[PDB]
Design an enzyme around this catalytic site. Sequence first.
Site, mmCIF file in Angstrom:
data_model
loop_
_atom_site.group_PDB
_atom_site.id
_atom_site.type_symbol
_atom_site.label_atom_id
_atom_site.label_comp_id
_atom_site.label_asym_id
_atom_site.label_seq_id
_atom_site.Cartn_x
_atom_site.Cartn_y
_atom_site.Cartn_z
ATOM 1 N N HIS B 41 62.854 -131.638 -51.921
ATOM 2 C CA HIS B 41 63.287 -130.281 -52.199
ATOM 3 C C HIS B 41 64.767 -130.184 -52.560
ATOM 4 O O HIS B 41 65.299 -129.083 -52.697
ATOM 5 C CB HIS B 41 62.915 -129.310 -51.051
ATOM 6 C CG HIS B 41 63.785 -129.398 -49.829
ATOM 7 N ND1 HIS B 41 63.327 -129.898 -48.625
ATOM 8 C CD2 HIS B 41 65.034 -128.933 -49.588
ATOM 9 C CE1 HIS B 41 64.253 -129.730 -47.696
ATOM 10 N NE2 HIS B 41 65.299 -129.145 -48.255
ATOM 11 N N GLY B 143 72.044 -127.396 -44.496
ATOM 12 C CA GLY B 143 72.730 -128.576 -44.996
ATOM 13 C C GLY B 143 72.349 -129.861 -44.263
ATOM 14 O O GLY B 143 72.707 -130.963 -44.695
ATOM 15 N N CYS B 145 69.289 -131.074 -43.919
ATOM 16 C CA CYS B 145 68.105 -131.747 -44.444
ATOM 17 C C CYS B 145 68.458 -133.162 -44.884
ATOM 18 O O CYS B 145 69.537 -133.417 -45.427
ATOM 19 C CB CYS B 145 67.508 -130.945 -45.587
ATOM 20 S SG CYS B 145 66.806 -129.403 -44.999
#
Lengths: 306, 306
Positions: B41, B143, B145
């Site tokens: 993503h 942030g 991820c």
Amino acid sequence: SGFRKMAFPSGKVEGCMVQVTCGTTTLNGLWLDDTVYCPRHVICTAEDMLNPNYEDLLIRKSNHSFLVQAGNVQLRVIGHSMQNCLLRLKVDTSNPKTPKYKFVRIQPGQTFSVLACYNGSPSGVYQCAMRPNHTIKGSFLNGSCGSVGFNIDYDCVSFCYMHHMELPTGVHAGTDLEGKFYGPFVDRQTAQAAGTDTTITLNVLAWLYAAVINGDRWFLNRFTTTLNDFNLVAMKYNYEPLTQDHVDILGPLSAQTGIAVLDMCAALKELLQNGMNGRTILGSTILEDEFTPFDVVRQCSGVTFQ
Amino acid sequence: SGFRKMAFPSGKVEGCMVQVTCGTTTLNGLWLDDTVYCPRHVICTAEDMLNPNYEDLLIRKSNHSFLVQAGNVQLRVIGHSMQNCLLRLKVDTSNPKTPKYKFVRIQPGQTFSVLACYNGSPSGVYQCAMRPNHTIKGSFLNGSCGSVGFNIDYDCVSFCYMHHMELPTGVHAGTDLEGKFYGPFVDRQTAQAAGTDTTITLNVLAWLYAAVINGDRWFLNRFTTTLNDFNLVAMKYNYEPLTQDHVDILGPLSAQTGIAVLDMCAALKELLQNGMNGRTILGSTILEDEFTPFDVVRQCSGVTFQ
């Protein structure tokens, strides 16, 4: 979201750990540039620890009485000196993994990460707080003497603690990196108990603020309190007296949540008087006091979940 | 003696963290040899992504679209592909800090350390457990991820989790390093939510063994129970059913202490039905469930990592 007792990443400290042996005594040392720091009691046998005179014990040693090892590799000692309760050993090679660092003496109630090591090898990292009585509250790992405590700002490691001794109650005592003990402790294997301890009020309030930032307000109430009236209650529950300075430190958290500091104090007063009624805050069934206001600001969102 | 919640030393993983940017989206990536792994993503809209077509979006992406930064160095991407919910970016430099490693898929109940990271820079490390409901109660902000979870055995890092999403209750969901989610979660905006969770019985039992090993044994008694009778009780307290396989996993701790697992279960039954009556176990007022039998064996046996 979420809230955990997190430690600083330990890599910068891992690259500085070594093993130091004198006779049959081995413990951990911290290798920065061309110097190795370790507890001076490495020169003591269990016997010596009953009533050691470090000056007399050390004068009988030579540079080659010390074997410093980084992994399986020996580092040659070319100088040595004692600084308070620490031994400083100069070695013939520099540690290229030395991070930018500073030595700092922390205040009771402040937190730091500890990299627990055995024979110069890291086993784990955990976060703790210097108790008001200068002891560390958890249980240390066997043979961890020499392991260090630290905080990291950007890429600078601030070393603040070196583990030296085990206490009767099972708590631990140590020094700063200049070798001065935290608390009324000395490096002699004798009964020395910690003074009375208290709950770190400033931290409990910081943590209640964290709970609000994360979306929970169940424990708030419609009351306020004066600093004096709060202390009159909190001190009955063995909480450290709260001062205006502490109140000022909570300013940012207060501004972010819209809850005045004294209003959060009124909430804490009620929690102390009535209990949590089987409920939890940030997953805990008890009030947590090992997160400083700085820890909360660093971990929580700067945006409150309204 | 010595026992408390610890994360593994994070150095070996810190050396693998990088920042991956696609347009206005920046997250973390894991750099091992010449491949950078990250959540797919990273190639999604602006602050949102409802039902994206990943295979289609990747087509309109060139190697130059991906900015990968390791510290202050730009890593040139020379290839890219998708593997389940991850992107594998081939870079022109093999990571000099690559540790010995493996990719493993852990089971519910098992623990691991998480290195929280933002903009490719490690910020903190904590220990957590994969919940029976396939989520982790982590601590993550926007942030994060791409942050990974891992275990270390000797000198080998077993990566087991890559972070992808936060669910409505503030808990977290992610994948193994092959890009397959733990649980039924997907990397898109849906009404997906964490299901009901249970307490990890196996780990609570491991922790009671840790307590005994450390001298905290007031809860033991002279009785035993059948597995079935234990489950009838445990399940009423929302504890995961104990299986014979779980009993076997506790064999090493049961052998070390000489306390049969079903005898320990009888002690736990009593604790659930009567509480602690004021007392504590390893300093806690509640039964801890995020220490596995292996965590106990490793800690209580003094293991370190090379």
